[PDB]
């Protein structure tokens, strides 16, 4: 048994190129160039896609908002089909889609965080020359038909010809699980006690407590791997780990291949998790900045981080097609943290 714990809401946005233009039905140019396109009374657009394992397919699309609605239909599980929990929203530009997930719903892997392949198809991938008139109407594809998704990332900011079409992925909520057996935890450096971090000129490997600290400043803790615990101190230390290094606050994302790098920022070093003698857990978010010693990461020199706001939210673990039973009484004592935590002197407690 265990508990899902999100430190911030999942978020992603479609990424228009700066050279692109929105489709412009009003104008009468004989042929609009490489404008983005989202269907028309004249022209359907396909949008094959698979986010959180629930495939979305349609080819009667006439406008982007229909795509928004049809995507929104999958947000909740039905009598049969699983729901994703992800909520699409129209992008303010009118350019594309703003994906957002409160990941406070459900209790399985699919309901949490954002994941999204962009399957070949995607006439809604909005990059095709099309042409107007002569005479009545008629917007038309420039030589049938419209181009497909290909190895784009029609709107995803990147390209990847190898294999299946590229998929952004963005983790913000990790899971935790108890076990009766003893469980040691991989130690790492803290910017407080337990000093310290000897750089090893350029090369990473150092001491293991410092080695884990090296990898940590990439995306190594951003992994969706399950995290076991037993003694309570395991739990607090681990929550502190993930709170500091384990979330994509920017709304950036892993994008296809797992190639972790230094960020500005996933880091939020000033966070602290403590156990008061009352027995309550405590989490604090100091306004204070921190520093990253050379040569941890990236960078080669010292670097400083600004603390960033957090918004905890908590549910309960449950595997798909599994027999694990929800344990509500425990999820409650942790359920106390569900509100927003702005930077400041306030300290939440369990």
């Amino acid at each position: 048994q265990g508990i899902w714990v999100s430190y911030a809401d999942a978020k992603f946005t479609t990424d228009r190129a700066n050279g692109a233009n929105v489709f412009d039905p009003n104008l009468t140019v004989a042929q609009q160039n490489n404008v983005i396109f989202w269907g028309n009374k004249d022209i359907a657009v396909t949008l094959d896609i698979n986010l959180n394992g629930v495939r979305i397919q349609n080819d009667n699309i006439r406008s982007l908002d229909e795509a928004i609605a049809y995507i929104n239909t999958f947000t909740a599980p039905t009598d049969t089909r699983d729901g994703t929990g992800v909520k699409a929203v129209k992008k303010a530009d009118g350019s594309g889609i703003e994906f957002v997930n409160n990941n406070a719903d459900g209790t399985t892997d699919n309901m949490k965080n954002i994941d999204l392949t962009v399957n070949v198809g995607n006439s809604a991938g909005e990059r095709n020359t099309i042409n107007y008139n002569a005479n009545t109407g008629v917007f038309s594809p420039q030589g049938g038909n419209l181009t497909t998704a290909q190895n784009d990332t029609d709107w995803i900011a990147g390209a990847a010809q190898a294999g299946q079409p590229q998929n952004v992925k963005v983790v913000t909520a990790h899971k935790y699980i108890y076990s009766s057996n003893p469980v040691t935890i991989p130690p790492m450096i803290n910017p407080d006690g337990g000093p310290a971090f000897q750089p090893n000129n350029g090369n990473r490997p150092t001491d293991p407590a410092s080695a884990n600290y090296w990898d940590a400043i990439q995306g190594s803790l951003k992994n969706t791997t399950e995290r076991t615990f037993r003694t309570t101190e395991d739990l607090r230390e681990l929550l502190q780990r993930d709170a500091r290094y384990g979330v994509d606050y920017n709304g950036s994302g892993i994008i296809d291949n797992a190639t972790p790098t230094f960020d500005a920022n996933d880091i939020n070093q000033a966070v602290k998790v403590v156990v008061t003698e009352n027995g309550n857990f405590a989490i604090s978010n100091a306004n204070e900045t921190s520093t990253i010693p050379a040569n941890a990461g990236a960078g080669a020199g010292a670097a400083t981080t600004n603390p960033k706001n957090m918004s905890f939210n908590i549910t309960a673990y449950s595997n798909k097609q599994g027999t694990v039973s929800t344990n509500d009484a425990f999820t409650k004592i942790f359920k106390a943290f569900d509100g927003p935590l702005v930077i400041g002197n306030q300290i939440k407690e369990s």
Binding site: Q321, G322, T323, S325
Partner: protein, 50 residues
């Protein structure tokens, strides 16, 4: 489909359990003669023969 072990039903033995929507343990996957069935009112359907 939960446990994916193949234990065939109708054995009148090897009765098998599951934790319920609450927490109580209860019986699952047991076939019944159908001649024992009662409706919501508790009246016997009294099915017989052919």
């Amino acid at each position: 489909t939960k446990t994916q072990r193949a234990e065939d039903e109708n054995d009148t033995g090897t009765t098998q359990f599951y934790t319920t929507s609450k927490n109580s343990v209860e019986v699952t996957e047991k076939g019944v003669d159908a001649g024992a069935l009662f409706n919501a009112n508790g009246t016997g359907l009294n099915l017989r023969d052919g």
